[PDB]
Paper text:
The 70-kDa heat shock proteins ([name]) are chaperones with central roles in processes that involve polypeptide remodeling events. [name] proteins consist of two major functional domains: an N-terminal nucleotide binding domain (NBD) with [name] activity, and a C-terminal substrate binding domain (SBD). [name] proteins bind and release client polypeptides in a cycle that is coupled to an [name] activity. We present the first crystal structures of four human [name] isoforms, those of the NBDs of [name], [name], [name] and [name].
The major [name] protein of the endoplasmic reticulum is [name], originally called immunoglobulin heavy chain binding protein ([name]), or glucose regulated protein-78 ([name]). [name] has crucial roles in the assembly of ER proteins and protein complexes and the unfolded protein response. [name] crystallized with ADP and calcium in the active site, and with calcium bound to a secondary site, whereas we observed the products of ATP hydrolysis (ADP and inorganic phosphate) and a divalent cation in the active sites of the remaining structures. Only the [name] structure contained ADP and metal ion but not inorganic phosphate. Metal ion coordination geometry and distances suggested that here the bound divalent cation was calcium, which was present in the mother liquor. Thus [name] may have lost magnesium and inorganic phosphate after cation exchange for calcium during crystallization. The slightly opened nucleotide binding cleft of ADP-bound [name] distinguishes it from the set of NBDs that crystallized with ADP and inorganic phosphate in the active site. Cleft opening in [name] is brought about by rotation of subdomain IIB by approximately 5.8°, as determined using the DynDom server. This mechanism of cleft opening is similar to that determined by crystallography of [name] proteins in complex with nucleotide exchange factors, but differs from that observed for actin. The largest rms deviation in the Cα positions was found for [name], where the overall rms value is higher than 1.3 Å (only 17% of the backbone trace shows an rms difference lower than 0.5 Å).
Numbering used by the authors:
A (entry chain A): 28 to 406
B (entry chain C): 19 to 213, 216 to 408
Amino acid sequence: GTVVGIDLGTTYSCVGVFKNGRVEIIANDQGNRITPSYVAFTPEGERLIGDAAKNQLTSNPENTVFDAKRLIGRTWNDPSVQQDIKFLPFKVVEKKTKPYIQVDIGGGQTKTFAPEEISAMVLTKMKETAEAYLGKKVTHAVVTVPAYFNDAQRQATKDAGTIAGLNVMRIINEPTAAAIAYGLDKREGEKNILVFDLGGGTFDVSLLTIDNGVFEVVATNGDTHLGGEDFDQRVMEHFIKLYKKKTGKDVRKDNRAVQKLRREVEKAKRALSSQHQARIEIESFYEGEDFSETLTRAKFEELNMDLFRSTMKPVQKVLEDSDLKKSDIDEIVLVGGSTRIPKIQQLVKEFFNGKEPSRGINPDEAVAYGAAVQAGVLS
Amino acid sequence: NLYFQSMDVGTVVGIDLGTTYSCVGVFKNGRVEIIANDQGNRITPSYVAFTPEGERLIGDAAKNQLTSNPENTVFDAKRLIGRTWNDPSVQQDIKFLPFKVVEKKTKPYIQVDIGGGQTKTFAPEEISAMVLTKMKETAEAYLGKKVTHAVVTVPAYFNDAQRQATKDAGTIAGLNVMRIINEPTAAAIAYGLDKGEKNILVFDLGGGTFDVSLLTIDNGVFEVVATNGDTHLGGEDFDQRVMEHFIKLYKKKTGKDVRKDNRAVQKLRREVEKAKRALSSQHQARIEIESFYEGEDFSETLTRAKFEELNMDLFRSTMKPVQKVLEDSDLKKSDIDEIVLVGGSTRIPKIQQLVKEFFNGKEPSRGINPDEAVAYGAAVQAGVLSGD
Ligand SMILES: Nc1ncnc2c1ncn2[C@@H]1O[C@H](COP(=O)(O)OP(=O)(O)O)[C@@H](O)[C@H]1O
Ligand SMILES: Nc1ncnc2c1ncn2[C@@H]1O[C@H](COP(=O)(O)OP(=O)(O)O)[C@@H](O)[C@H]1O
Ligand SMILES: [Ca+2]
Ligand SMILES: [Ca+2]
Ligand SMILES: [Ca+2]
Ligand SMILES: [Ca+2]
């Protein structure tokens, strides 16, 4: 019927549709165009998806599930799983040599879910937000995945669709989707495209060569665990030790203070993508005392200096591996929420000797945008 | 002979001017009171830092900023104080200090950028002066009075040039140092070992130095009979073994080599250090650093057994100088009446266990906080000079 395009992202997902000549990115029933890729199990037996799952994360660390994409379609033995496991606050147990996620569901009950079951529940949220908008049922979808995903990861993403009641007609590589979003599907000779994708917890760089609807991912690279969250973390550290210094108080063991801080740091960072200062204020922050500081853009870039510079290495590396030089790159496509950071943009611009990157698509929505275009072609 | 405090000028302080930390105490109201600093810490890092912006930092704030400001953060000044340039100790040390040490008038001087385009050159005793000034001020905030006189401790092996240079450092700081006393003697005094003829072994293992001293006491007369040790072995080395294990392990679990990233290394060091301290009173320590390297996190458990294994050879080698002081002082291990263990690293259970086994089960002395014992003893002598 009407096929949806879904960006099923690490930290956020996005659903779009092609209806009456254009791509419509669909707002969820809480008013947002992207939805958190979170699922929570409450004590009272209630299953929450999205924003509701995420606002309930501090109070429910063990049964708020996220980052399912990091596990999806992998075996227990994957070195990547072996590391990730140590940092997830929910239980992951080995079963049939695959990661399974184990949560309490209330009434004394435990369940284990395959990562793809958890992703399934995210897809069910996207499905329902699509159907509400379209006024009708949705059964088919184009879902994107990272370019370095192997068959078992792709198949597992397809299985998620099925668990969710979607037929995932096509799986499309995220950089190709971003490429399609910017009209690089237009038939206009051979082009070498660098897609620089920077989300909340992951950095992917992809060199794609395009040739009249023939897309090839030549080389891929990145930092599997570098993202927007890390930039929040540099700033958190700065402020926690500044708070100690002024008030004598250390807040690190107080999960309530810490996460109120994280929440305001997150708001501050976002704002510092289009202002040079943001006031971080919290009332009754710690033992009755308030918190007030202004963060400058200068201080934000200073505290993240090297994380920002180190995004250049995977770029140089993908040009080496595809036997190209920076002069060979015809479009630079910047996608992922964190590419809104002017310094990131500036460091990329500078790297390519003044070339401006393509413009006119929303970086938070680009991958879903591309998927939706192809959904509309597939029909 | 006797010092009389007034209403404006307070009692005599005892100071442990140590290699990596210092501690100041006082005898007041019949007890030794070990004075906490403005940070709430009962020991203070023996560190001075000179920021770009012209601020001189001392203690914890100097140390807090050692990675970002390596060339202008000074420490280990005790390693150079009262020594000639030609001293083989100095020639070795300067190779390893991250701040500049030039020769002036045949003596080592420390040269730092003091802000505003200027450099200054400080004698090691000027740097210890600054540490002593922080200790002075800590005392004065506690006493609500000025502090003008002190008893300061030094290693048994210090010579006259080294003792004089410690006295001069007090002098630069405004402290009349009434008495210099040996650290192990100070440690003996804190355990009451001054109140027939006893033989005392003092095992002092700090952050960077290991000092063993054999001491006789006869009717309140102390004599340092033999001294030995490893002048560069201390708790910092035990961190170094654990650091190496994790840099290696991290490379092979994740591919990532972090060795030349000083921010990551410093971050690991802080957590290894905290871990170590915790393994002196529990059997496992978590080491968790968020965004350790290129956004990737770090998470590992260090067990006490793993900690002992990594340092096995280092711990056992602390027995060789204990044997040498016995040989050199012509005593058998059975001639030792008292074992005193002091220094923060003697909190390590395996170190306690090795010393105890070396003396066929003999228990060490116990009533005093091992990183405060040197100060405590100094503080007690401070009291006898002030009339209590
Ligand atoms: N205005 C902004 N400035 C800086 N970072 C932003 C902004 N908006 C979103 N981000 C960051 O984008 C990250 C999420 O990227 P996104 O692509 O939406 O999700 P995913 O992590 O699933 O790829 C978050 O860390 C968020 O803070
Ligand atoms: N609980 C503990 N367990 C193990 N080592 C400790 C503990 N507390 C302190 N230390 C070690 O003691 C060393 C410092 O000893 P100290 O006598 O305080 O100073 P100095 O080095 O100036 O003699 C440090 O290496 C520190 O890690
Ligand atoms: Ca994304
Ligand atoms: Ca050493
Ligand atoms: Ca990260
Ligand atoms: Ca000591």
